[PDB]
Structures are given as C-alpha cells and as structure tokens.
Design a protein around this ligand. Structure first.
Ligand code: NIO
Length: 319
C-alpha cells in the first residue's frame, strides 16, 4: 500500500502502553470541583475551578463510548505540553451520573467566520505557521488529528494565540494499518478518504490544512463545497482534474466506486491563479500558490510534510 514519509516508525520505538489506548485507565476526579457557568461561545461549558477560582473549559463526553473516551484521553496526555496543542488540565466524572468530562485551559476565541475576514497576508502566514507547529508536534509523537478544520483551530487574535482542539477523532499511526475513512468533516476530507483508501497517514491532516489555507487566501469558505461525500470528490476533481484523479487511483491500485461513473464528468486541472479576483488579490501571492499546490494534490505520499511546509518561502516573514 503506502507508508508515511517522516514519522513512520515512532510508535515502534514506544512501549505498548503509549499507543495501546484501549488498555489505558484514566484517573477520574470529582466534577463537583467545577462550577459550570455558561455555554462556551457544543456540550462544552465555561467553568470555574471552585478551589482556586480559575476559569477553565469543561467538555462533557458521551458516557457509553468507552473506546473513544480512552483514546481521546490517552492522546491528549501523550501530547501534553506540545506547542499550540490544547492543554488537558483534568479528567473528571460527575459523582451522580458518573458521566466523564475533560477539563481544558481557557482560550478566548474569535469565531473564524468573522476573524478570517480581517486577516492580512501576514496574519494568515502567522497563524498557519502556528498550526503547522501543532501538527508537526503531534505527527512527531505518532498521532494523526484527523479533524483539522477552522472550528477546531481556536485563535485569540488579541494575544496572537492558537490552539488545536478536539482530539476526539485522533489516532495513532502504525505503518500499513487500515483506518476508518469516515473521519474528518466533509469539506476537509482528503481524496484518500473519499475513494475509500484505508492505508492513509499524517498527510491527511496536511490536505485539511491546505483546504484551510485555500479558503483563507481566496475568501471562498469552504473552498471545496461538496453537498455530500460523493459530490465532495467531484468538487475536488473540478479543480485538481479528473484524469489526474485517475492517475492517482492507478498508482495506488484503488478501484473507483462505480457511482462516480456518471457524476465525475471531465474536468481539466485548473491553475490556482484562476481563483484570484479583486476581493482576494491582497491575500494571494506566487509563494502562497506554490505552497498550496504542494499541499492540495491527490498523492498523499507526495504532499508536503508539516515540517517541509514550515520551510516554505511563504513563511519567511514569520520565521
Ligand atoms: O478539545 C475540545 O473539544 C475543546 C477544548 C477546548 C474548547 N473547546 C473544545
């Protein structure tokens, strides 16, 4: 099949305890230590630690999902202290219902729908670079996020702080492992997911990041706007090209779902310059498009790693 180009073996250098999350036994404190005051900005609340009066964020989990709770807790613990990764403060249970919850550092977020409209060229370079630091970090620890999207990138624009959140879909990368392709959120799903290729890796997060970069510099949010998972691939092919899609599938011996036969159509590859017009011209540059082209490409294995992306000339002003 395929393997990752950069942190392929990191989990083989770990003790089984590190990645065997089904065996992890969280220590559950008492949620009564927390006063849940308001909804944050889903089942996430602003809270006050009653002991020290510190503001935190409490995320209530779904009690019946044992595997995923252990997986999210283990991954968050493995990543603790990672650059721009949301800090898990505590793991607690409500003493009556026994429902598990996670306690996180508080970040005063600006909704991306408003924030992205005032970002400058420099701002986009700055925050993308910060997000790349988080991805390079978690990839280096053998973990794929699998849900990179604007809602999961909290930004405090006052303090210039960025935190990558919601590790509920994150998984450990093991070479040749076959994963669930029904992950991420529709607009940010990589083509490997949409064609049911299960042997994917960290490069999935780099596709999602590319989708974010495209929506920020082009002001088309989301950039690939599929109406369903099938149409999502069609939207991508209208840009990257249909013959190019087939080349990708041939290289990895992927059979295309026959449903695509009559909806895919025929589309030549578009040059990224095609998406420039007066409303986004001040966010676009040749270096932006060169980076983008090396992220949003079918071949997951040839996509830039997070570290390679960080070395790109697009980030020279923020390095
Ligand atoms: O990890 C999460 O889901 C999270 C963390 C802080 C704030 N909102 C969500």
């Amino acid at each position: 099949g395929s393997r990752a180009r950069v942190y392929a073996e990191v989990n083989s250098l770990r003790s089984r305890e590190y990645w065997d999350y089904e065996a992890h036994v969280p220590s559950w404190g008492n949620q009564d230590d927390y006063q849940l005051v308001r909804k944050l900005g889903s089942e996430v609340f602003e809270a006050i630690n009653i002991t020290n009066n510190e503001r935190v964020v409490v995320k209530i989990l779904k009690p019946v999902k044992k595997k995923k709770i252990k997986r999210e807790v283990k991954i968050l613990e493995n990543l603790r202290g990672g650059t721009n990764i949301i800090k898990l403060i505590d793991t607690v249970k409500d003493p009556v219902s026994k429902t598990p919850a996670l306690v996180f550092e508080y970040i005063n977020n600006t909704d991306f729908k408003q924030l992205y409209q005032i970002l400058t060229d420099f701002d986009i370079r700055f925050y993308m670079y910060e997000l790349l630091k988080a991805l390079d970090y978690c990839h280096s620890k053998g973990i794929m996020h699998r849900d990179v999207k604007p809602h999961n990138v909290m930004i405090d624009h006052q303090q210039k702080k960025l935190r990558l959140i919601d590790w509920g879909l994150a998984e450990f990368y093991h070479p040749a492992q076959e994963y669930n392709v029904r992950v991420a959120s529709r607009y940010f799903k990589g083509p490997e997911l949409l064609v049911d290729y299960q042997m994917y890796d960290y490069s999935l997060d780099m596709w999602s990041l590319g989708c974010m970069l495209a929506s920020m510099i082009f002001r088309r949010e989301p950039f690939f706007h599929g109406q369903d998972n099938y149409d999502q691939l069609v939207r991508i092919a209208k840009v990257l090209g249909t013959e190019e899609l087939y080349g990708y599938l041939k290289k990895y011996h992927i059979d295309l779902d026959p449903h695509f036969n009559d909806i895919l159509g025929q589309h030549s590859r578009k040059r990224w310059e095609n998406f420039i017009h007066s409303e986004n011209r001040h966010l676009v540059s040749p270096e932006a498009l060169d980076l983008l082209d090396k992220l949003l490409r079918y071949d997951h294995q040839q996509r830039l790693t997070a570290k390679e992306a960080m070395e790109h000339p697009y980030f020279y002003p923020v390095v």
